[PDB]
Design a protein around this ligand. Structure first.
Ligand code: 19F
Ligand code: MG
Ligand code: ZN
Length: 338
């Protein structure tokens, strides 16, 4: 593979050379060509100075990065570009929110690596599908819940344990353990069921105020930051959120079609004959995404622009909802669709 050759021998490019706006909340990482993303991951790790901080072997890191990228499939939304954009948001939080005042370096490093790995081997199907379709993943994990998230973590472990890919193998036995426990907790935090379970604890933390000496506050904050990274497409301009909604519903409806094919009745949001996209997106933005970015703003006043963009995008869904009702004739002037 020549992609590895270049990552290894060309040198780690400075982040500023990628784009003048690369470290800004206005930057859209999906604009970066996919062939430049692995070098961008090295550039971000170097700019956060984790390579020198942790004495990471650059050939091992290059192999690890390429293995993680190869570990993603190509469903419409849950692909490497999603993992890359999530990792890029983690980097933006580091650069704009001064995370070093709240978390340990090892926790921030674990959060970034978790962002890269958090949807490994996603097939475009959700946790409920695994159980309903009686998949091997359900057989392995259904009794413990968070089926896909347990699989994503297991895939990350399998990559670390691949010859020449263990970026942490020189860590002390305490730090190596710490890193795996952090990756496990952070990846499991991407299940909506987990976020709903900890939501009251997040509210309590934001209410009492963050305590850097409280180990449970560090853990809760990492969960909040991970979910803020995972939903970060919603903090970009309208155009980005509109295209990402297209990708998500294409993926969801392909799942619903598989379910109908197996004789199952899919949930309304996975059924292309029932799902009403503006109501579903408004519910997601108002009840799930906005409270996450509002908690982020409560803890970090500099995150106010993120919450304001999510609120602005939520308002835009109300503004264009009327377009889902066909007034007049369709574009082709035909009633053939009837
Ligand atoms: C009312 O409930 C929903 C309404 C709409 C959706 C579709 C959706 N899912 N979504 C997602 C995830 C769901 C994220 C669930 C979550 C997990 C942890 C913390 C918060 C949310 C999908 C693609 O898997 N990311 C984004 C940016 C979106 C997005 O804009 N829309 C999903 C919903 O529930 C899962
Ligand atoms: Mg996921
Ligand atoms: Zn994700």
């Amino acid at each position: 593979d020549d992609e590895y050759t270049k990552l290894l021998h060309d040198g780690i490019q400075p982040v500023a050379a990628i784009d003048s706006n690369f470290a800004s909340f206005t930057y859209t990482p999906r604009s970066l060509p996919e062939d430049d993303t692995s070098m961008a991951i090295l550039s971000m790790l170097q700019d956060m100075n984790f390579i020198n901080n942790y004495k990471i072997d650059c050939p091992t890191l290059a192999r690890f990065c390429l293995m993680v990228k190869k570990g993603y499939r190509d469903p419409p939304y849950h692909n490497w570009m999603h993992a890359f954009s999530v990792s890029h948001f983690c980097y933006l939080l580091y650069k704009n929110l001064e995370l070093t005042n709240y978390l340990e370096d090892i926790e921030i490093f674990a959060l970034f690596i978790s962002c890269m790995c958090h949807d490994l081997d996603h097939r475009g199907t959700n946790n409920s599908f695994q159980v309903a379709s009686k998949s091997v993943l359900a057989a392995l994990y259904s009794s413990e819940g968070s089926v896909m998230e347990r699989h994503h973590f297991a895939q990350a472990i399998a990559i670390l344990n691949t010859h020449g890919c263990n970026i942490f193998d020189h860590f002390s036995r305490k730090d190596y353990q710490r890193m795996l426990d952090l990756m496990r907790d952070i990846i499991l935090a991407t299940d909506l069921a987990h976020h709903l379970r900890i939501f009251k604890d997040l509210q309590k933390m934001a209410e009492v105020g963050y305590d850097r000496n409280n180990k449970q506050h560090h853990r809760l904050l990492l969960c909040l930051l991970m979910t803020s990274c995972d939903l970060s497409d919603q903090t970009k301009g309208w155009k980005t959120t509109r295209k990402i909604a297209e990708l998500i519903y294409k993926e969801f409806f392909s799942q619903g079609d598989l379910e109908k094919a197996m004789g199952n009745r899919p949930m309304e949001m996975m059924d292309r004959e029932k799902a009403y996209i503006p109501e579903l997106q408004i519910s997601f933005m108002e009840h799930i995404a906005m409270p996450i970015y509002k908690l982020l703003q409560d803890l970090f006043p500099k995150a106010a622009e993120l919450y304001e963009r999510v609120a602005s995008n939520r308002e835009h869904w109300t503004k264009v909802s009327h377009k889902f009702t066909i007034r007049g004739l369709p574009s082709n002037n035909s009633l053939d669709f009837l």
